[PDB]
Amino acid sequence: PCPGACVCYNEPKVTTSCPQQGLQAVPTGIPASSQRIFLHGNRISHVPAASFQSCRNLTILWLHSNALARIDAAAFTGLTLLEQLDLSDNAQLHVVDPTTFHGLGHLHTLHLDRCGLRELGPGLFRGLAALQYLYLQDNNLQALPDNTFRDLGNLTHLFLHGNRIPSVPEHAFRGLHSLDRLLLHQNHVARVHPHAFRDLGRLMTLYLFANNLSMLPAEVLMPLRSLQYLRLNDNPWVCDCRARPLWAWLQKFRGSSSEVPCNLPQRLADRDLKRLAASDLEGCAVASLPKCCQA
Ligand SMILES: *[C@@H]1O[C@H](CO)[C@@H](O)[C@H](O)[C@H]1NC(C)=O
Numbered sequence: 001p002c003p004g005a006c007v008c009y010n011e012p013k014v015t016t017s018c019p020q021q022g023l024q025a026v027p028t029g030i031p032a033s034s035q036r037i038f039l040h041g042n043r044i045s046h047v048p049a050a051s052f053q054s055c056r057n058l059t060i061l062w063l064h065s066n067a068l069a070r071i072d073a074a075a076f077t078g079l080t081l082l083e084q085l086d087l088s089d090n091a092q093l094h095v096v097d098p099t100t101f102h103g104l105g106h107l108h109t110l111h112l113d114r115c116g117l118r119e120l121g122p123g124l125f126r127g128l129a130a131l132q133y134l135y136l137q138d139n140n141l142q143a144l145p146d147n148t149f150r151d152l153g154n155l156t157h158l159f160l161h162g163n164r165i166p167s168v169p170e171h172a173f174r175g176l177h178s179l180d181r182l183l184l185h186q187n188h189v190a191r192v193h194p195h196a197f198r199d200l201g202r203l204m205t206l207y208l209f210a211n212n213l214s215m216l217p218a219e220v221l222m223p224l225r226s227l228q229y230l231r232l233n234d235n236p237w238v239c240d241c242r243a244r245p246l247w248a249w250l251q252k253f254r255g256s257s258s259e260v261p262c263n264l265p266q267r268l269a270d271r272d273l274k275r276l277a278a279s280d281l282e283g284c285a286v287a288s289l290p291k292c293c294q295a
Pocket residue numbers: 032033034054055056057
């Protein structure tokens with residue numbers, strides 16, 4: 001039967017619904033035929049291995065807005081039909097065992113926003129070949145290691161804003177051939193490797209505003225042949241000789257772009273790099289140092 005104060009019904013999908021009823025733990029005796037399990041808004045602190053293993057046909061599991069501090073690495077083992085997993089708004093989770101998501105080959109959406117996550121461990125997203133949406137915003141990430149998303153060939157939306165990512169290495173986004181939207185704003189990005197976006201030929205939206213970029217090689221943006229929306233505002237852009245390549249790329253860009261506000265030199269403060277004449281970019285505003293500032 002139906003456990004605790006949960007509500008169980010069959011249409012449109014077999015559902016076990018137990019939201020906001022003061023649960024401290026995952027209830028036992030969840031009906032095995034459950035296709036959807038809603039446990040959001042309680043005070044659940046742990047997800048043991050045995051939690052959902054009877055539920056063969058499970059496709060949707062919501063655990064957002066709880067008090068999750070730990071998830072057993074075997075919590076979601078054998079849930080081969082799982083399509084939606086929501087662990088968001090558990091700000092004290094901090095860490096997910098790198099094997100937690102292994103075997104989830106039907107997973108389409110993974111909500112990990114506002115989980116206080118400190119890092120993306122090796123192999124955390126291995127084998128998630130069906131994943132389309134990955135929410136990682138508003139965590140505590142301080143790195144984007146190479147090949148973190150290597151197997152995510154069907155991913156279309158990747159949200160990484162509201163972290164503390166300091167830089168983007170060459171192969172951080174390797175394998176993301178289907179990616180359409182990449183949100184990297186409100187981080188600490190000080191540099192992007194020249195070939196970091198090589199595989200993003202189908203990207204349509206890129207947000208990089210509210211970071212720490214003083215410059216960006218044109219090579220960074222060159223592979224983004226499908227780009228339609230670009231945001232680069234709220235960065236400390238240096239509008240001198242080092243900006244000439246980005247300037248030139250911007251002149252030919254047919255999409256929509258934010259302001260690219262100059263921070264230096266003072267005479268160009270808050271004017272748009274995009275809207276400057278090439279003659280404004282002569283010289284060096286500093287006089288670690290870019291090539292044109294050495295010659
Ligand atoms: C999954 O759904 C099928 C309906 O085709 C049903 O026969 C089966 O018992 C369900 N699985 C469980 C564990 O109840």
